[PDB]
């Protein structure tokens, strides 16, 4: 079970994945870590774990197509069974999505379909939401990004700051992302016809419940 | 690509495999190492590499069936895509072979079908063979042990001690076992109907040539 993780920053989710592989909770290994930002601390987490790292900077390519062409080329050297987006903040082209159809995962910090874009925590707090959360989903060419596999909700209280909420959501992420990856590694989770199936059961719109 | 290696001694072949996974020559990872001997140095090589180790001593079991039942139970916790026998000096039962059918590899220190048993080096020298070598094969419940995938031959000269020939063959082992495993990891090597196939072609009785 070869895992390739794509990141853009801190890498706390990447770390939770690395940790779960080490305990064998995830019966697999992170073979390589890719980042579109050279200064991402996630690259350091990978280097300290003895994991191969690669960085592709946008300015080194003259088109989004060329960038993804090289990205696919480099990722495939590791023969990934699953490609995991963990804080990767760069849109992946349809060609990339198709190439890894059914084996591309993403984690989005909101209770989809709400706040499908950027600044999710900011929006939750400013709109005074009572609940917030995160969603792990299969990435497809669909307009909504793909079928949700699992969500985690967290309460939002009056005094909470954006950092308070962000950290609270990330704690859930560190738990559900490795869990979802373990379901995939175990062959229990599969994507088919733009739908997520767990243990042969078609999952509802907001994931396993 | 999860690899589980079974050993009984030194572990030099295990090391060559670990090294090839590290360089990504083998697009996979050794997830666990099993030994039927607590004193095997190979276990130290594994521990130093941060690889989970397990030892199953024969005296702790009252039947070959019970021993293999536990071995299967423990190996499966790592969800191996390939089980690699590298110096494992204990016969595996038909149930074990069947359980890992098509994904069980072994390396034998002789140019099969010659000297299919023990003390191969001793025999090659005593009979005055001008050639000796090693054979990697898929393990099946057949009388010959399974289809040969690849062999490596070494010349034998007058004046060579059993230690000389053994070391010479060992050098070839370290080259061909990781190669064969890389072919399996790349999806190029498959076992179909007790025969070995590389790139869709049925391999010769004595392996790839
Ligand atoms: N085909 C496809 N489909 C999706 O659904 C994608 C989903 C994402 C993630 C995200 O929705 C943010 N949605 C995901 C998100 O916010 N991820 C959160 O990250 C944290 C990481 O924590 P950690 O590092 O401690 O683990 C975690 O808590 C995790 O939940 C998304 C979308 C667009 C852009 C973007 O327009 N980028 C511009 C550049 C912008 C700029 O740099 O200025 C571009 O030109 O491509 C960036 C991110 C990225 C690529 C995708 N690609
Ligand atoms: N079903 C099945 N089929 C096969 O073909 C098997 C093939 C083997 C390997 C071997 O042929 C030795 N043939 C293989 C062999 O000699 N391996 C060589 O080892 C070196 C390791 O180097 P390294 O450690 O530095 O990497 C390398 O150069 C490598 O090629 C074989 C045969 C019989 C016995 C045995 O009768 N054992 C008794 C007694 C056990 C005891 O005393 O405890 C038993 O009761 O089971 C053991 C090994 C083991 C289990 C098998 N099981």
XYZ file of C-alpha atoms and ligand atoms in Angstrom:
522
model
C 0.000 0.000 0.000
C 1.878 3.048 -1.322
C 0.658 6.456 -0.204
C 1.791 9.731 -1.782
C 0.781 12.843 0.124
C 0.514 16.348 -1.361
C 0.885 19.329 0.996
C 1.359 23.104 0.942
C 2.068 23.933 4.573
C 2.369 22.829 8.179
C 1.710 19.165 7.579
C -0.105 18.218 10.785
C -2.437 15.977 8.775
C 0.536 14.470 6.963
C 2.016 13.761 10.413
C -1.107 11.994 11.661
C -0.933 9.824 8.541
C 2.761 9.048 9.017
C 2.073 8.204 12.671
C -0.806 5.873 11.807
C 1.338 4.027 9.242
C 4.031 3.561 11.864
C 1.586 1.967 14.333
C 0.208 -0.058 11.419
C -3.264 1.419 12.018
C -2.923 2.222 8.320
C -1.448 -0.937 6.740
C 0.706 1.012 4.335
C 3.477 3.540 3.949
C 3.883 7.149 2.899
C 6.380 6.703 0.059
C 6.748 10.345 -0.910
C 5.588 13.845 -0.071
C 5.052 16.571 -2.676
C 4.654 20.286 -2.012
C 4.066 23.344 -4.177
C 5.787 25.456 -1.500
C 9.479 25.048 -0.657
C 9.049 26.420 2.861
C 6.262 24.034 3.901
C 7.111 22.573 7.317
C 5.449 19.380 6.130
C 8.523 18.760 3.987
C 10.631 18.843 7.143
C 8.297 16.368 8.869
C 8.800 14.075 5.877
C 12.571 14.536 5.768
C 12.846 13.716 9.470
C 10.850 10.538 8.837
C 13.201 9.581 6.010
C 10.486 10.036 3.387
C 11.307 11.185 -0.149
C 10.281 14.782 -0.844
C 9.666 16.748 -4.029
C 8.741 20.377 -4.548
C 7.218 21.805 -7.729
C 7.123 25.606 -7.757
C 4.576 27.264 -10.069
C 7.044 29.789 -11.512
C 9.074 26.898 -12.940
C 6.228 26.022 -15.312
C 4.614 28.055 -18.074
C 1.152 26.500 -17.769
C -1.060 24.651 -15.316
C -1.013 21.773 -17.801
C 2.790 21.508 -17.816
C 2.863 21.659 -14.025
C 0.466 18.736 -13.625
C 2.259 16.811 -16.377
C 5.460 16.880 -14.335
C 3.545 16.262 -11.098
C 1.952 13.109 -12.552
C 5.327 12.040 -13.901
C 7.044 12.392 -10.532
C 4.197 10.965 -8.412
C 3.943 7.856 -10.593
C 7.569 6.998 -9.875
C 6.245 5.829 -6.489
C 3.382 3.769 -7.950
C 0.861 5.174 -5.486
C -2.187 3.139 -4.569
C -3.684 6.321 -3.158
C -2.827 10.015 -3.561
C -3.739 12.091 -0.519
C -4.260 15.862 -0.614
C -3.519 17.116 2.909
C -3.578 20.879 2.879
C -2.556 21.065 -0.791
C -3.644 24.574 -1.816
C -3.343 24.410 -5.599
C -6.127 23.412 -7.988
C -5.447 20.101 -9.727
C -6.388 19.928 -13.412
C -9.030 17.580 -14.846
C -6.207 15.564 -16.444
C -4.689 15.005 -12.999
C -8.035 14.071 -11.458
C -8.736 11.574 -14.235
C -5.274 10.020 -13.981
C -5.848 9.186 -10.315
C -9.585 8.513 -10.592
C -10.787 6.495 -7.620
C -7.533 6.839 -5.708
C -7.384 10.574 -5.025
C -8.510 11.774 -1.583
C -8.938 15.260 -0.153
C -9.862 16.779 3.194
C -11.903 19.968 3.281
C -12.357 21.974 6.509
C -16.113 22.506 6.388
C -19.347 20.581 6.648
C -19.882 20.205 2.905
C -21.870 21.270 0.959
C -21.444 24.397 3.095
C -18.394 26.635 2.480
C -16.907 24.617 -0.431
C -14.245 27.272 -1.022
C -11.530 29.058 0.947
C -11.530 30.652 4.408
C -13.988 28.128 5.853
C -13.220 28.831 9.509
C -13.513 32.576 8.914
C -16.950 32.101 7.314
C -18.214 29.789 10.055
C -17.333 32.278 12.793
C -18.534 35.409 10.967
C -21.870 33.813 10.068
C -22.247 32.756 13.696
C -22.641 29.048 12.970
C -23.405 26.709 15.890
C -21.498 23.833 14.295
C -18.474 23.481 12.036
C -16.317 20.588 10.898
C -14.369 18.795 8.215
C -15.072 16.440 5.311
C -12.932 13.798 3.627
C -13.966 13.026 0.054
C -12.934 11.286 -3.148
C -11.836 13.899 -5.686
C -13.677 13.678 -9.014
C -14.231 16.000 -11.977
C -17.718 16.755 -10.661
C -18.562 20.365 -9.830
C -18.859 19.607 -6.118
C -15.472 17.913 -6.088
C -16.614 14.350 -5.472
C -18.525 12.044 -3.060
C -18.039 12.639 0.668
C -16.697 9.676 2.629
C -16.793 10.877 6.220
C -17.429 14.095 8.118
C -16.658 15.207 11.666
C -18.529 18.039 13.374
C -17.355 20.336 16.166
C -19.344 22.832 18.270
C -18.761 26.576 17.973
C -19.148 28.763 21.073
C -19.419 32.553 21.454
C -15.903 33.155 22.749
C -14.103 30.974 20.193
C -11.484 32.656 18.012
C -10.680 31.583 14.455
C -7.577 29.827 15.766
C -9.649 28.084 18.450
C -12.056 26.686 15.857
C -9.305 25.860 13.365
C -7.422 23.768 15.920
C -10.622 22.086 17.102
C -11.417 21.045 13.533
C -7.864 19.856 12.888
C -8.069 17.518 15.884
C -10.989 15.794 14.159
C -9.055 15.746 10.890
C -6.106 13.952 12.508
C -8.564 11.253 13.539
C -10.808 10.831 10.513
C -8.271 11.210 7.698
C -6.116 8.304 8.851
C -9.308 6.311 9.502
C -10.532 6.862 5.950
C -7.128 5.983 4.533
C -7.170 2.769 6.607
C -10.571 1.847 5.111
C -9.072 2.323 1.660
C -5.931 0.328 2.458
C -8.083 -2.482 3.861
C -10.049 -2.573 0.606
C -13.286 -1.646 2.380
C -13.611 1.765 0.730
C -13.946 2.217 -3.004
C -15.067 4.860 -5.462
C -17.294 3.844 -8.361
C -19.627 5.818 -10.615
C -18.784 8.979 -8.676
C -20.052 7.396 -5.455
C -18.265 6.266 -2.287
C -18.885 2.675 -1.159
C -17.949 1.351 2.289
C -18.211 -2.398 2.908
C -20.369 -2.652 -0.200
C -22.752 0.044 1.032
C -23.338 3.210 -1.007
C -22.623 6.136 1.319
C -25.106 9.029 1.580
C -24.279 12.621 0.424
C -22.573 13.611 3.667
C -20.642 10.386 4.127
C -20.812 7.491 6.557
C -23.405 8.004 9.291
C 3.148 -2.564 -1.949
C 3.503 -4.249 1.468
C 6.333 -6.761 1.825
C 6.618 -9.236 4.696
C 9.934 -11.069 4.877
C 10.480 -14.392 6.633
C 14.025 -15.271 7.725
C 15.932 -17.721 9.918
C 19.448 -16.263 10.008
C 21.897 -13.582 8.895
C 19.406 -11.618 6.821
C 21.716 -10.332 4.076
C 18.975 -10.870 1.479
C 16.548 -9.038 3.765
C 19.026 -6.166 3.869
C 19.346 -6.015 0.081
C 15.539 -5.804 -0.090
C 15.316 -3.110 2.576
C 18.011 -1.156 0.715
C 16.189 -1.422 -2.625
C 12.916 -0.234 -1.085
C 14.765 2.761 0.371
C 16.073 3.822 -3.069
C 12.608 3.112 -4.485
C 14.139 0.563 -6.884
C 11.458 -1.631 -5.331
C 8.299 0.525 -5.224
C 7.235 -0.845 -1.878
C 8.143 -1.276 1.765
C 9.127 -4.085 4.126
C 6.350 -3.833 6.737
C 7.380 -6.671 9.021
C 10.011 -9.359 9.446
C 9.246 -12.813 10.837
C 11.759 -15.365 12.097
C 11.548 -18.893 13.495
C 14.786 -18.236 15.393
C 15.141 -15.635 18.153
C 18.898 -15.352 17.584
C 18.708 -14.461 13.872
C 20.899 -11.442 13.135
C 18.335 -10.550 10.484
C 16.067 -9.479 13.318
C 18.689 -6.940 14.375
C 18.909 -5.593 10.839
C 15.134 -5.138 10.942
C 15.049 -3.501 14.369
C 17.778 -1.083 13.309
C 15.692 -0.188 10.260
C 12.697 0.473 12.490
C 10.812 -2.513 11.081
C 8.362 -4.492 13.213
C 9.700 -7.936 14.160
C 7.992 -11.168 15.198
C 9.441 -14.483 16.299
C 7.598 -17.800 16.318
C 9.496 -20.580 18.056
C 8.532 -24.144 17.124
C 8.523 -25.352 20.748
C 5.711 -22.916 21.568
C 3.407 -24.922 19.285
C 2.248 -28.550 19.315
C 1.688 -29.085 15.592
C 2.860 -27.680 12.272
C -0.753 -26.688 11.660
C -0.939 -24.591 14.838
C 2.369 -22.919 14.051
C 1.264 -21.934 10.550
C -2.171 -20.842 11.780
C -0.494 -18.329 14.108
C 2.053 -17.334 11.460
C -0.759 -16.572 8.994
C -2.739 -14.699 11.643
C 0.242 -12.470 12.470
C 1.526 -11.939 8.919
C -1.953 -10.885 7.775
C -2.005 -8.035 10.257
C 0.372 -6.333 7.815
C -1.795 -7.074 4.750
C 1.155 -8.271 2.653
C 0.978 -7.912 -1.111
C 3.939 -10.258 -1.238
C 5.453 -12.663 1.298
C 9.178 -13.149 0.818
C 11.107 -16.160 2.088
C 14.726 -15.047 2.483
C 16.670 -17.759 4.245
C 13.572 -19.133 6.003
C 14.567 -22.671 6.927
C 11.242 -24.195 7.925
C 8.826 -25.940 5.563
C 5.523 -24.114 5.150
C 2.340 -26.215 5.119
C -0.008 -26.550 2.120
C -2.525 -24.320 3.931
C 0.087 -21.574 4.222
C 1.099 -21.899 0.574
C -2.532 -21.779 -0.558
C -3.290 -18.777 1.649
C -0.544 -16.771 -0.090
C -0.959 -18.352 -3.523
C 0.575 -16.184 -6.225
C 2.238 -13.842 -3.754
C 4.754 -16.111 -2.033
C 8.379 -15.931 -3.192
C 11.439 -17.962 -2.269
C 15.121 -17.881 -3.143
C 16.932 -21.208 -3.415
C 20.775 -21.473 -3.467
C 21.050 -23.797 -6.475
C 20.406 -23.922 -10.185
C 17.057 -25.702 -9.977
C 16.034 -28.375 -10.717
C 19.460 -29.440 -9.391
C 19.910 -29.846 -5.622
C 16.331 -28.941 -4.614
C 17.058 -29.608 -0.948
C 19.596 -28.664 1.703
C 23.390 -28.319 1.560
C 23.362 -27.176 -2.071
C 26.830 -25.595 -1.967
C 28.287 -28.707 -0.367
C 26.799 -30.767 -3.206
C 27.832 -28.483 -6.077
C 31.475 -28.698 -4.970
C 31.524 -32.413 -4.160
C 30.108 -33.320 -7.592
C 32.553 -31.084 -9.432
C 30.068 -28.770 -11.132
C 31.638 -26.038 -13.275
C 28.667 -23.814 -12.472
C 26.512 -23.063 -9.453
C 23.958 -20.411 -8.633
C 20.668 -19.241 -7.215
C 17.017 -19.471 -8.266
C 14.076 -17.256 -7.321
C 10.655 -18.870 -7.668
C 6.973 -18.572 -6.830
C 6.182 -21.075 -4.104
C 3.324 -23.452 -4.955
C 2.107 -26.756 -3.536
C 3.735 -28.635 -6.411
C 6.466 -31.247 -6.023
C 9.119 -28.951 -7.499
C 8.060 -26.088 -5.248
C 6.820 -23.711 -7.936
C 7.730 -21.966 -11.234
C 11.216 -20.494 -11.489
C 11.268 -16.751 -12.183
C 14.957 -15.959 -12.543
C 18.277 -17.703 -11.989
C 21.804 -16.362 -11.688
C 24.808 -18.541 -12.467
C 28.318 -18.262 -11.088
C 31.361 -20.129 -12.398
C 33.115 -22.647 -10.154
C 36.917 -22.882 -10.199
C 39.260 -25.481 -8.732
C 40.504 -24.089 -5.451
C 37.200 -22.515 -4.456
C 36.074 -23.351 -0.936
C 32.406 -23.840 -0.077
C 32.667 -20.422 1.545
C 34.021 -18.921 -1.680
C 31.239 -20.329 -3.861
C 28.619 -19.482 -1.236
C 29.714 -15.835 -1.074
C 29.875 -15.649 -4.864
C 26.294 -16.919 -5.119
C 25.275 -14.557 -2.311
C 26.377 -11.584 -4.413
C 24.021 -12.717 -7.180
C 21.185 -13.278 -4.685
C 21.381 -9.652 -3.547
C 21.033 -8.555 -7.152
C 18.284 -10.829 -8.450
C 15.936 -11.083 -5.473
C 15.320 -7.319 -5.306
C 14.978 -7.287 -9.129
C 12.349 -10.016 -9.057
C 10.530 -8.209 -6.264
C 10.663 -4.964 -8.272
C 9.051 -6.777 -11.214
C 6.267 -7.918 -8.913
C 5.865 -4.405 -7.466
C 5.673 -2.965 -10.987
C 2.900 -5.407 -11.843
C 5.065 -6.988 -14.552
C 5.421 -10.380 -12.833
C 2.442 -12.643 -12.193
C 1.825 -16.259 -11.265
C -0.943 -17.868 -13.361
C -1.782 -21.591 -13.171
C 1.490 -22.602 -11.466
C 3.573 -20.815 -14.116
C 5.455 -17.506 -13.920
C 4.632 -14.744 -16.416
C 6.663 -11.606 -17.103
C 5.134 -8.833 -19.223
C 2.373 -11.232 -20.251
C 4.715 -13.984 -21.421
C 5.090 -17.440 -19.883
C 8.641 -17.707 -18.539
C 10.919 -20.662 -19.453
C 11.192 -23.586 -16.987
C 14.494 -22.199 -15.731
C 13.168 -18.657 -15.613
C 13.704 -15.509 -17.617
C 16.392 -15.880 -20.284
N -9.428 18.963 -8.999
C -9.404 19.462 -7.623
N -10.549 19.310 -6.800
C -10.556 19.792 -5.464
O -11.724 19.617 -4.688
C -9.401 20.440 -4.938
C -9.388 20.950 -3.596
C -8.217 21.606 -3.087
C -8.255 22.182 -1.640
C -9.040 23.616 -1.557
O -10.447 23.455 -1.823
C -8.882 24.283 -0.153
N -9.739 23.329 0.705
C -8.819 22.490 1.536
C -8.152 23.015 2.822
O -8.351 24.174 3.233
N -7.367 22.178 3.460
C -7.042 22.301 4.866
O -5.667 22.572 4.952
C -5.250 22.329 6.302
C -3.828 21.784 6.289
O -3.367 21.546 7.621
P -1.965 20.933 7.891
O -0.968 21.418 6.992
O -1.538 21.254 9.384
O -2.300 19.420 7.671
C -6.217 21.281 6.837
O -6.895 21.687 8.049
C -7.132 21.035 5.644
O -8.463 20.716 5.975
C -8.426 24.672 -2.576
C -9.123 25.002 -3.811
C -8.558 25.943 -4.721
C -7.294 26.570 -4.415
C -6.662 27.567 -5.367
O -7.661 28.227 -6.166
N -5.364 27.775 -5.436
C -4.852 28.747 -6.382
C -3.653 29.513 -5.719
C -3.967 30.367 -4.441
C -2.843 31.141 -3.748
O -1.835 30.491 -3.385
O -2.955 32.383 -3.548
C -4.441 28.077 -7.679
O -3.944 28.959 -8.670
O -4.538 26.842 -7.861
C -6.598 26.257 -3.204
C -7.146 25.320 -2.287
C -7.031 21.745 -3.926
C -7.044 21.233 -5.267
C -8.223 20.588 -5.778
N -8.247 20.093 -7.115
N 5.717 -24.985 1.032
C 7.145 -24.706 0.955
N 7.823 -24.849 -0.280
C 9.207 -24.597 -0.389
O 9.826 -24.756 -1.648
C 9.943 -24.184 0.759
C 11.358 -23.938 0.687
C 12.079 -23.529 1.868
C 13.614 -23.294 1.791
C 14.489 -24.681 1.784
O 14.316 -25.407 0.557
C 16.012 -24.390 1.954
N 16.321 -23.717 0.606
C 16.588 -22.261 0.842
C 17.926 -21.714 1.391
O 18.880 -22.459 1.679
N 18.013 -20.413 1.540
C 19.258 -19.691 1.434
O 19.502 -19.130 2.701
C 20.467 -18.090 2.566
C 20.069 -16.971 3.522
O 20.975 -15.883 3.464
P 20.750 -14.625 4.327
O 20.148 -14.927 5.575
O 22.151 -13.923 4.568
O 19.815 -13.803 3.382
C 20.358 -17.622 1.131
O 21.601 -17.811 0.407
C 19.204 -18.459 0.591
O 19.220 -18.735 -0.801
C 14.149 -25.626 3.003
C 13.673 -26.990 2.788
C 13.371 -27.825 3.911
C 13.541 -27.309 5.256
C 13.224 -28.158 6.481
O 12.956 -29.520 6.103
N 13.193 -27.681 7.708
C 12.865 -28.553 8.821
C 13.828 -28.247 10.035
C 13.934 -26.776 10.598
C 14.872 -26.501 11.781
O 15.955 -27.132 11.918
O 14.502 -25.624 12.598
C 11.394 -28.381 9.196
O 10.944 -29.184 10.269
O 10.639 -27.589 8.594
C 14.008 -25.978 5.470
C 14.312 -25.137 4.369
C 11.369 -23.362 3.129
C 9.961 -23.610 3.198
C 9.247 -24.031 2.030
N 7.857 -24.291 2.106
